[PDB]
């Protein structure tokens, strides 16, 4: 469960093929690299996303396919960020769906 740690997730992004898609923001928002193409997987909701298009963004795409992710929904999780404030800044604004 060191993957609960952003630091650990960030480390899996070795040989990340997308120079334009921020691996730091992906790791920060629950994702880790699966090393299969460009697909990443959220450690908190389990969604797997790949075939990224340059118009795609880390958080919105994540919310799009997993609107109920505990991390994005801002409910408690075992996530250990590197910088809490940076995480707060990027997570979707509180919105009761």
């Amino acid at each position: 469960n060191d993957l609960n740690r952003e630091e650990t997730r960030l480390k899996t992004f070795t040989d990340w093929p997308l120079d334009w898609l921020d691996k730091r923001q992906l790791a920060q928002t629950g994702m880790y690299f699966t090393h299969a193409g460009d697909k990443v997987k959220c450690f908190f909701c389990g969604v797997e996303i790949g075939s990224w298009e340059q118009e795609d963004q880390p958080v919105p795409e994540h919310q799009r396919w997993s609107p109920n992710c505990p991390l994005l929904r801002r409910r408690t999780t075992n996530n250990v960020p590197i910088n809490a404030e940076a995480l707060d800044r990027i997570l979707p604004p509180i919105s009761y769906d």
Binding site: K39, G46, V47, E48, I49, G50, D56, W65, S66, C69
Partner: peptide, 7 residues
């Protein structure tokens, strides 16, 4: 993007 796995 494409979701290969959906919760």
């Amino acid at each position: 993007a494409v979701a290969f796995y959906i919760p």
